[PDB]
Design a protein around this nucleic acid. Structure first.
Ligand code: MG
Ligand code: MG
Ligand code: MG
Ligand code: MG
Ligand code: MG
Ligand code: MG
Ligand code: MG
Ligand code: MG
Ligand code: MG
Ligand code: MG
Ligand code: MG
Ligand code: MG
Ligand code: MG
Ligand code: ZN
Lengths: 173, 146, 242, 125, 129, 151, 107
RNA sequence: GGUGGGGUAACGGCCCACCAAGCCGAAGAUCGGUACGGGCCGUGAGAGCGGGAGCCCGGAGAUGGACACUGAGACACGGGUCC
RNA sequence: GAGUGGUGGCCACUAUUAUUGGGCCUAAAGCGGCCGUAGCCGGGCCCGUAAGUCCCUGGCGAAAUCCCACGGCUCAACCGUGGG
């Protein structure tokens, strides 16, 4: 036979030039300030996988099925994508925008640490943001609900000083 | 014609035999299993080949087109057979000299054969004396050894 | 093995009852021939190094063993390839600790702490029984060891019985028969590590192995092979079990 | 030399192409044709696993047993007949099942001289 | 020649229901056809039916109510295990609980819903929806 | 349809469903058996005996009386004849077909060019072989029994 | 006498050393049941067994048959057409590895 | 295939002497073609179709064809002999 | 998008191999006609058996590879502990 070969984690469109899909994806890319299409596609694949797990477990029965069902629900609401009282059916109503709201770049922007999405990306990449006492430099990292409030400037960063000229401009917004 | 047969629960052998029997009428299956292409391929299953130029020729386009397409005769190093290769580009024939060595590959027509208005030509020139022909046509590079 | 015996063992092909990381390195210790078989034993080096953690590298593990710091069934073992198996007793007298080797609920070997007094006895399952020259009876136990008894007591011992042996003197002190109502502990199969009491025994023609039915504490009945049932007491266990 | 591995013919009659060389553990040895002679002659063969066989090539005495369980050591005169091969009796070849004549009567050989190194026979009434 | 009395009955029923017949006669009767008719009546697909005795194998008289979309026999009679009913449902039925499959088990003839409740398999013989 | 000609004739008897003999029938079982034996001794075929019984004596099929000796089965003409030892050695339809074949063969000796009649002979012999296979299976004929026209 | 099969021994005795009932032969392994289809050679029979094989792609069955050569002791002496029971032994010839132990239904 | 032996670490037409005519086959023998086998890998909604170099388990080989010594184990890749 | 093009091969496209699931009056395709051996498919009721078939339960089908949750490298790819 053949040994294992590592495979891509995302899927490409079936047809590269469809006008409606191009327009929709362009709107998303502009709004969330992503670097290239593949990054976007990555998140899409994640969404699809969740749905494909929900569809398979609805039509199943037995002992392992219940365990996997509760594990899926717990994982989904640990990420902050579902409320605490959601049921399995609610999985089938998630959208691509729901996942994009959990990116570290977006959350840094929404919390008011930056004036713009691009500034948030630069702040993350250069190492000015700490999450739960740890510095992370990946703008696409998905933030868990339990750690969302412990996101601040790094304690060694120049921005961790309210008199810094650039921070005062950020606070002005 | 009645119902498709056999449908019986214990008629597996006959059904398998029938399917195997009529699969030989599929031309794609027959050529793969009997390996008919490998038996007549001058390139011997390779994607590219290297050869030596013997002479320059020109081929007329088919009706209702008009024009002359510049090609060369190439003798293959690996087995000594002689084939015809098209030279793509505007004025590309001026960079070819007799006794040069070239790299050729498929021209890319339907069913791995010829394309366009020049049937009978199955290959095209890619390199001349280890230099890309496309560059030479565009410039950006000079043909070595004059 | 084109021309002779194998001397090596890859990590990926190691026995499935060990606690070992199969991708950290290339090679594993090939165990020496000894008391138990491959499926129910582990080399002593892994006990010294990986289980208890008294050593970090193999080189300093061998230095500990050569000083005679480890006792297996009351005897000093220096070979780092020595196999240690089911129902054995591992004693460290310098630290004063004792363990018994037992299968897990999923079939892996673990060390179960025991008291010092219990460390002097070992249960042995009578695996076979034969006549030997001079008209004596030889008993062959499940771990490969042997014992001799006179012709007078030939009716006090049969296969599948359990003998409680005092180690390292190897002196018999108790015989536990195999019958209805005996307390058993399962060593292999799907029902490994479950324990209970014997209810029924069944037999089959033409050499197929025989099956026993066991009732546990909660009152459930389950079947297993007779040779996988290890007698440990009359109506209560005589040794500590997890 | 003498190879005892497998047949080169399938039971249906088709031929078999050999797929490997001959292994050392599959070889035989020359048969020992135990003759009747004035003096006994034997050798020792080193065999697989470092074991030994005692091979008898010339025989002069025999052990003859009666239905009562007693045995006597007597010498061999000749071989009357041998069902194993059609011309063994003429050449005085002793194998298991041969009929020999001794100084106390006819006897039938019960041992394998090529494997044991001794000749044992039962007395015929 | 005649090979399958059960298939003829179901094809006759589905042919008759498409032209608004109110009753039909099944000419060769048998115990299996009676069991299938009983199961069909339990779910409300047909009305009352009765057995008429000639000197031959007997006849069945069946009342139709116009509540059948399609009815057919399954050949060959595939064996099915107690947890494999979904793919056959997708093969023969239009929705996830639309209609019934009729199964012969060692406890009698029944719909596949009852068989799945009891946790047993059997042989598929017909579908109705 | 017909075995060879593939026609679809439907003519036949339409027996009403009844179990007990009719009221107006007055013969007992013994009288019927005596009549059957007498008619057989006159030299009639099994099918002809029933025809005569129906037409002249007003007796519908004798399969309306239980067998007095074997209560599990009803009465038939062949069983009645077997009870007295008058039953045919060879089944009647096979005998009739063989008799038809013998007569036709001697016709074809004087008319070798009558090819249309020869096909009838071939069909008759096909029927004969089907019947002999069936009767061998059920044990009504010895296993070595064979059909040879040259006999 | 019993040899582990729990069936009736044959009526009479024999002197064949290859007889499991009266000789030194031992039986161990599979036990099959079949129909004799040939008895031409001395002390040898051919036994045929039929079974069904399931074709996964076509979800249907086909019929297959297995033929085995077996030793025929004189005390039993099976013939063509009857049901026999056979058991596995050590190799006896190039193709014989079974022995007939019982005739279940004489032809 | 049987009977009687030899040889082997060991059962066996594995090899001999003698007695018989058996054994395989249109449910594909025999012969020819192409290939190391598997766990697995690629693709597809699935049913399927195609491949089986790299990591693990099993087999075989040491320029081609034959043959031996030592040893628990070889007819031995960095041991021996002939063409 | 640190990649993007050319040539050859396999799968899909393809219900152009059709068990699920294709066709044969006029488009490729019903032997010129019939009889019959093996095979496949075979009418109704009653009794028995339990080979096929269904359910429960023992012994097996190495590890790696696949899916899920949790844990360790900044997260991930990767690796460990459990459930399949
Ligand atoms: Mg490979
Ligand atoms: Mg292959
Ligand atoms: Mg390589
Ligand atoms: Mg296409
Ligand atoms: Mg078409
Ligand atoms: Mg026609
Ligand atoms: Mg025509
Ligand atoms: Mg029927
Ligand atoms: Mg069964
Ligand atoms: Mg595994
Ligand atoms: Mg960490
Ligand atoms: Mg993680
Ligand atoms: Mg892992
Ligand atoms: Zn016998």
């Amino acid at each position: 036979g053949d040994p294992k070969r590592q495979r891509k984690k995302y899927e490409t469109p079936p047809h590269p030039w469809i006008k409606e899909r191009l327009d929709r994806e362009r709107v998303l890319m502009d709004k969330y300030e992503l670097k290239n299409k593949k990054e976007l596609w990555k998140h899409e694949t994640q969404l699809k996988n969740f749905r494909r797990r929900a569809r398979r477990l609805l039509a199943a029965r037995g002992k392992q099925a219940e365990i996997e069902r509760e594990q899926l629900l717990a994982r989904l609401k640990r990420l902050g994508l579902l409320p605490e009282d959601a049921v399995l059916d609610d999985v089938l109503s998630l959208t691509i925008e729901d996942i994009l709201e959990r990116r570290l770049q977006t959350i840094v922007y929404k919390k008011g640490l930056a004036r713009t999405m691009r500034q948030a990306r630069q702040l993350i990449v250069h190492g000015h943001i700490e999450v739960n006492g740890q510095i992370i430099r990946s703008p696409s990292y998905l933030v868990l609900k339990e750690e969302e409030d412990t996101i601040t400037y790094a304690r060694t960063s120049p921005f961790a000083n309210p008199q810094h000229p650039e921070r005062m401009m950020i606070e002005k917004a | 014609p009645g119902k498709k047969a056999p449908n019986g629960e214990f008629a597996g052998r006959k059904l398998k035999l029938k399917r195997k029997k009529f699969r030989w009428s599929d031309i794609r299956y027959k050529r793969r299993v009997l390996r008919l292409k490998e038996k007549s391929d001058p390139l011997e299953g390779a994607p590219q080949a290297r050869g030596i130029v013997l002479e320059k020729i020109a081929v007329e386009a088919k009706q209702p087109n008009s024009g002359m397409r510049k090609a060369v005769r190439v003798q293959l190093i690996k087995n000594g057979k002689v084939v015809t290769a098209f030279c793509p580009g505007d004025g590309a024939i001026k960079f070819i000299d007799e006794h040069d060595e070239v790299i050729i590959e498929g021209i890319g027509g339907p069913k791995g054969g010829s394309m366009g208005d020049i049937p009978g030509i199955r290959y095209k020139v890619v390199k001349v004396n280890r230099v890309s022909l496309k560059e030479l046509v565009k410039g950006r590079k000079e043909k070595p050894r004059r | 093995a084109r021309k002779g015996p194998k001397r090596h063992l890859k990590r990926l092909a190691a026995p499935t009852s060990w606690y070992i990381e199969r991708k950290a390195y290339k090679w594993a210790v090939r165990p020496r021939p000894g008391p138990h078989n491959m499926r129910t034993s582990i080399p002593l080096l892994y006990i010294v190094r990986d289980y208890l953690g008294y050593a970090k590298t193999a080189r300093e593990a061998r230095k500990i063993l050569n000083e005679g710091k480890f006792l297996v069934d009351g005897r000093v073992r220096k070979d780092y390839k020595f196999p240690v198996g089911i129902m054995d007793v591992v004693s460290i007298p310098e630290t004063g600790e004792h363990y018994r080797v037992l299968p897990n609920r999923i079939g892996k070997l673990i060390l179960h702490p025991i008291s010092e007094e219990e460390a002097n006895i070992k249960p042995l399952r009578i695996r076979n029984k034969r006549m030997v020259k001079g008209a004596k009876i030889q008993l062959n136990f499940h771990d490969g060891t042997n014992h001799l008894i006179p012709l007078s007591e030939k009716d006090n011992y049969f296969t599948s019985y359990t003998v409680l042996m005092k180690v390292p003197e190897r002196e018999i002190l108790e015989v536990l028969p195999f019958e209805k109502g005996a307390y058993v502990f399962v060593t292999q199969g799907k029902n490994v590590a479950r324990k209970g009491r014997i209810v029924e025994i069944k037999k089959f023609p033409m050499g197929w192995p025989d099956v026993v039915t066991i009732e546990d504490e909660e009152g459930e009945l389950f079947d297993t092979l007779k040779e996988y049932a290890f007698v440990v007491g009359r109506d209560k266990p005589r040794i500590s079990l997890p | 030399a003498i190879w005892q591995g497998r047949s080169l013919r399938k039971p249906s009659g088709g031929r078999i192409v050999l797929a490997r060389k001959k292994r050392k553990r599959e070889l035989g040895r020359e048969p020992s044709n135990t003759r009747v002679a004035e003096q006994d002659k034997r050798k020792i063969i080193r065999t697989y696993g470092g074991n030994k066989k005692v091979r008898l090539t010339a025989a002069a005495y025999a052990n003859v047993f009666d239905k009562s369980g007693k045995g006597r050591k007597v010498r061999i005169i000749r071989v009357i007949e041998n069902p194993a091969n059609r011309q063994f009796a003429r050449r005085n070849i002793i194998t298991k099942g041969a009929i020999i004549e001794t100084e106390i009567g006819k006897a039938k050989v019960t041992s394998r001289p090529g494997q044991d190194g001794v000749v044992n026979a039962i007395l015929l009434e | 020649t005649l090979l399958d009395p059960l298939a003829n009955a179901l094809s006759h029923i589905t042919n008759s229901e498409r032209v608004g017949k109110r009753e039909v006669y099944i000419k060769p009767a048998s115990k299996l056809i009676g069991e299938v008719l009983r199961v069909m009546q339990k779910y409300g697909y047909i009305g009352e039916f009765e057995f008429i005795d000639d000197g031959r194998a007997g006849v069945y008289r069946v009342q139709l109510l116009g509540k059948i979309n399609k009815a057919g026999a399954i050949k060959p009679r595939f064996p099915v295990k107690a947890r494999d009913y979904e793919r056959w449902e997708k093969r023969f039925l239009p929705a996830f609980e639309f209609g019934i499959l009729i199964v012969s088990t060692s406890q009698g003839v029944m719909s596949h819903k009852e068989a799945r409740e009891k946790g047993i398999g059997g042989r598929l013989i017909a579908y109705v929806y | 349809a017909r075995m060879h000609a593939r026609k679809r004739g439907k003519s036949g008897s339409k027996r009403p469903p009844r179990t007990a003999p009719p009221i107006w029938l007055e013969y007992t079982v013994e009288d019927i058996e005596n009549l059957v034996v007498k008619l057989r001794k006159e030299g009639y075929s099994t099918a002809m005996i029933g025809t005569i019984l129906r037409d002249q004596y007003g007796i519908p099929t004798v399969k309306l009386f239980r067998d007095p000796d074997n209560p599990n089965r009803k009465l038939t003409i062949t069983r009645i004849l077997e009870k007295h030892g008058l039953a045919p050695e060879i089944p009647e339809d096979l005998m009739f077909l063989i008799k038809r074949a013998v007569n036709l063969r001697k016709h074809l000796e004087q008319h070798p060019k009558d090819l249309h009649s020869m096909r009838g002979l071939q069909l008759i012999e096909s029927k004969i072989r089907r019947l002999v296979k069936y009767y061998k299976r059920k044990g009504k004929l010895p296993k070595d029994w064979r059909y040879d026209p040259e006999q | 006498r019993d040899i582990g099969l729990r069936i009736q021994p044959p009526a009479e005795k024999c002197d064949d050393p290859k007889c499991p009932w009266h000789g030194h032969l031992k039986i161990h392994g599979r036990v099959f049941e079949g129909i004799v289809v040939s008895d031409k050679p001395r002390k040898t029979v051919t036994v045929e067994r039929q079974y069904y094989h399931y074709l996964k792609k076509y979800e249907r069955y086909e019929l297959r048959r297995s033929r085995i050569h077996a030793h025929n002791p004189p005390c039993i002496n099976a013939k063509v057409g009857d049901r026999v029971l056979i058991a596995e032994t050590r190799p006896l010839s190039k193709t014989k590895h079974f022995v007939v132990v019982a005739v279940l239904e004489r032809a």
